[PDB]
Design a protein around this ligand. Structure first.
Ligand SMILES: O=C1CN(Cc2ccccc2)c2ccccc2N1
Ligand SMILES: O=C1CN(Cc2ccccc2)c2ccccc2N1
Ligand SMILES: [Mg+2]
Ligand SMILES: [Mg+2]
Lengths: 546, 546
């Protein structure tokens, strides 16, 4: 029956309410109780505050009217305002004190996710204050989670007037009884209740959610921890840079602040960072999530040497040159992780800081060809399989859905061993035709990867493994250097290929290395443990990259 | 005969040379003359400094070797180093003191422009210092102007070794006598001279340029002021954002720092900002140059109301939402200028600051339909011509090269009046079939616009003029507000349509308005007077947007 949920902002999605601050200021300053609220409401429908809420005037224009209203209320109550009495001040402090009320947002999310239409309905203002950006950020964070945000000052109408409710019902394409509306102000619910909307008077958050649960019949309170925000591909800004004539790089870009360049592994995609992108943007970074060379919408030339580490690094440098970035933070996973260490080693001036998921830094052995070194560790055998052009391509392209569903699995869901892959004659020889869906991924997400890899297949991606000798020789030029820029190594407990112990000597070459460690985390770190990855990255960025 | 020019960096393209600082430090600190230079050169080809210049070790690793070398030189000269003696300190100060030597760069540019291949050949290091970004910026600014930058630490070879010269000749695809090489160090010229290169020992900049001029036969010294750096379309990062299902916006993106969104007028393109984009990036801004709705690679739906100012503004807001920008600076010219004022009026929270070229802010008259207001000013008659769907499209599309060559003219080159356009029956009725090329634009630049407008023609662009009544009604909601965010109005003396006097009352509605004024500047402000536009914008950004 209920098909939509509408949330007030002040006192419902954002806390403390600002009327909250009018009460406290009065008391703090020992004024007559409600004086500030009387000055605020003065003139009712024709007073300064309604003009503000309707968008007739801006917040900077209203500030001095509210002042006058405060003088008038104080003369009529026969008191004096203190020296230094400042409406601008009180409101600045009140607006910056209000934060997102997380459990209300998470209930709104859950309702959206079971197919509700959701909106925010708020009496708010055109904010031209010096400090306006703080509230602009808050509104951006909330708004991306709802179908509509309706602001009194944008539509020229205010709660409790009945026209904003008709405007509400009409934007929702729903009828009065299909709608629940939560607000902390009883007067605002009245007209909704009159048209026959379910309404909830919001005092403490928990009781409201209990009423919302009872009325919608969906579980909202005490729900398990939700995933971080993911990305919809078609809502992202997509960027394209030609680094040389045959070769363009594609990337998805979100956020502002220091540039952070995310470099995925094999066989992945910018989308492998879907859970990191909004979190790092929200944390104040400019995220740039690559399709690396060979993948997705980046170019995929056929030749093997287009994919040696030297060329790949030079082209990441060109990518920065053409974007006009003197530096970025480089964060890599798997093959991308190897590449970011080599960026730190060959272009420290271009790298603000470097971090790797799973891939350790282990200096080349100048007395052992890497092809030989690889034979000494049974879990790397899959790399030998990858050598012969064509063999891995045929298997991996043969059925794309099967390929990614077989690969993208949590550590207890595995369907293949990386073990005697050559002997067995394939990565999938003893795995199902139709694997079950890992808990880590939805069917839709698998089909994103399938559609990406339909553009170029596995030749470019596999070529990353086809330059052993060439990479070894390049790496050897670097054996006298150390990595002395800010660096983070994140190991994953249950990565049975890129095992945490392989990283054990990294402090020899990177003396100031910082670490995180994720327990119960397989090879696909970002989607296995997105919440922990986000927390470890954001903390290290804020302390070392800022 | 000469086909290439090679410039050293330290002491040639960048000044003061850092050997410069070794001399001064010695004297400042009353040490034995040359002690610091001896410590620096110690061990010659096998000493610490060569390892550094070859890329074997990083700058942070070399610092303490140089220290040791300074202790050793001082004991052998029988003196003591002062308390607080700091190699890191001296070098930090020396590196940040060096700036681009502008007249050498401009000579290099001119030589490139007459078809020389140009390169930088430098002994330099892998720079992992905390403060590395300063030099990274300097190298980015220089490098974008040359065919090659060859660094000793990237190629594993050093001047004066003869292999870097062979590596040089081979990268240039030229022979010894086709090459001029400028360096401030005589030893470096020797091997070039041995292979038969022209060389120039660089002491004072002017004498070197006089030698370079004499030898190349091109005028380099006392040349007129050059244009700002322009943009090559295919070297830019191109971004695409879907703001709603039928509609994507394209933009070119360069630089990092506060987002600055450039909004061109009619009938233009992101490319109309070609001279501003590198300058604002170089000044520390993140430039976003739009194709506005209806143009270039942005969507161009056919319906008129898709182009009213309300819709256009809402979609610029969505563009910010999807890019994750809580604000941008909005700078507009012509129609883009009108739009940025309306962004300031309806979304101040999203606008960090607002500036307009040519387009004034004049509040709507609520007692006169704008269609009528327009009839009262003969220079706006071209807007009436634009009203009837199809009529202007047929004329403007009929011959694209003629259209833009007729429009894009400096103030003394005009070939049409905006005067009785309806009566005459066309914008071009009394103008040439094949106009001559304005001094403002090359043939290639005209053909960029021609190819852009081949994608969608003039329907979307002309529709910006087709919502008078709708825009008037929207604007009237704003008649109580003022613009109180930071704002800049730049008038152009010889814009005979958007005349400077039309802006005269703007302080009534924008009390803190700042101004610039450009003399001898027609309607096409950015390409008419790019140098002055850049200076006025960069100065106002640095003081009000930062
Ligand atoms: O394909 C490869 C390339 N190499 C050497 C290399 C050296 C330096 C940089 C990139 C690659 C490698 C080294 C270790 C494990 C696996 C591999 N697999
Ligand atoms: O096409 C137009 C639209 N209007 C009104 C308008 C009002 C507000 C915002 C955009 C447009 C206009 C006003 C003045 C000069 C020329 C024009 N030409
Ligand atoms: Mg409220
Ligand atoms: Mg020099």
């Amino acid at each position: 029956t209920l098909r939509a949920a509408v949330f007030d902002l002040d006192g419902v999605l954002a806390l403390p309410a600002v009327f909250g601050v009018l009460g406290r200021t009065e008391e703090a300053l020992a004024l007559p109780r409600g004086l500030l609220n009387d000055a605020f409401q003065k003139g009712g429908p024709e007073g300064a505050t309604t003009r503000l809420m309707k968008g007739e005037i801006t917040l900077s224009q209203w500030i001095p009217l509210m002042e006058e209203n405060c003088r008038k209320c104080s003369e009529t109550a026969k008191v004096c305002l203190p020296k230094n009495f400042s409406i601008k001040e009180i409101f600045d402090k009140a607006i910056s004190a209000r934060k997102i009320n997380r459990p209300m947002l998470q209930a709104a999310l859950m309702l959206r996710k079971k197919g509700f239409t959701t909106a925010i309905l708020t009496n708010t203002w055109l904010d031209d204050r010096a400090e306006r950006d703080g509230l602009a950020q808050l509104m951006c964070e909330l708004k991306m989670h709802f179908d509509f945000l309706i602001e009194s000052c944008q539509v020229g109408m205010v709660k409790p007037e009945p026209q904003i409710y008709k405007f509400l019902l009409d934007t929702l394409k729903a009828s009065p009884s299909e709608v629940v509306f939560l607000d902390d102000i009883g007067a605002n619910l009245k007209p909704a209740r009159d048209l026959g909307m379910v309404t909830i008077l919001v005092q403490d958050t928990d009781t409201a959610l209990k009423e919302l649960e009872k009325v919608t019949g969906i579980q909202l309170l005490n729900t398990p921890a939700p995933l971080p925000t993911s990305c919809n591909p078609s809502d992202m800004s997509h960027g394209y840079v030609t680094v040389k004539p045959r070769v363009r790089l594609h990337f998805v870009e979100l956020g502002s602040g220091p540039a952070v360049c995310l470099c995925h592994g094999f066989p992945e995609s910018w989308y492998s960072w879907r859970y990191q992108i909004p979190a790092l943007a929200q944390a104040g970074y400019r995220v740039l999530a690559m399709d690396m060379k060979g993948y997705g919408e980046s170019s995929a030339p056929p030749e093997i040497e287009e994919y040696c580490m030297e060329v790949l690094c030079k082209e990441m440098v060109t990518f920065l040159d053409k974007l006009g970035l003197s530096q970025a933070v480089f964060i890599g996973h798997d093959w991308g992780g190897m590449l970011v260490w080599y960026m730190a080693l060959f272009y420290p001036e271009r790298v603000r800081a470097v971090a790797s998921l799973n891939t350790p830094f282990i200096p080349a052995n100048p007395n052992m060809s890497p092809l030989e070194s690889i034979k000494a560790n049974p879990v790397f055998d899959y790399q030998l399989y990858f050598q012969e052009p064509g063999v891995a391509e045929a298997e991996l392209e043969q059925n794309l859905s099967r390929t990614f569903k077989s690969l993208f699995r949590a550590s207890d869901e595995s369907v293949l061993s990386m073990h005697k892959v050559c002997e067995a004659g394939g990565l999938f020889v003893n795995s199902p035709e139709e694997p079950s869906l890992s808990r880590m991924v939805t069917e839709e997400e698998i089909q994103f990867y399938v559609q990406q890899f339909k553009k170029s297949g596995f030749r470019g991606p596999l070529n990353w493994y086809r330059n052993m000798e060439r990479n070894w020789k390049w790496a050897c030029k670097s054996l006298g250097r150390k990595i002395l820029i800010p660096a983070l190594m994140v190991t994953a407990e249950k990565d049975f290929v890129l095992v945490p112990q392989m990283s054990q000597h990294m402090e020899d070459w990177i003396p100031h290395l910082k670490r995180g460690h994720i327990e119960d985390c397989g090879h696909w770190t970002q989607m296995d443990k997105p919440t922990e990855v986000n927390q470890i990255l954001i903390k290290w960025l804020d302390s070392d990259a800022r």
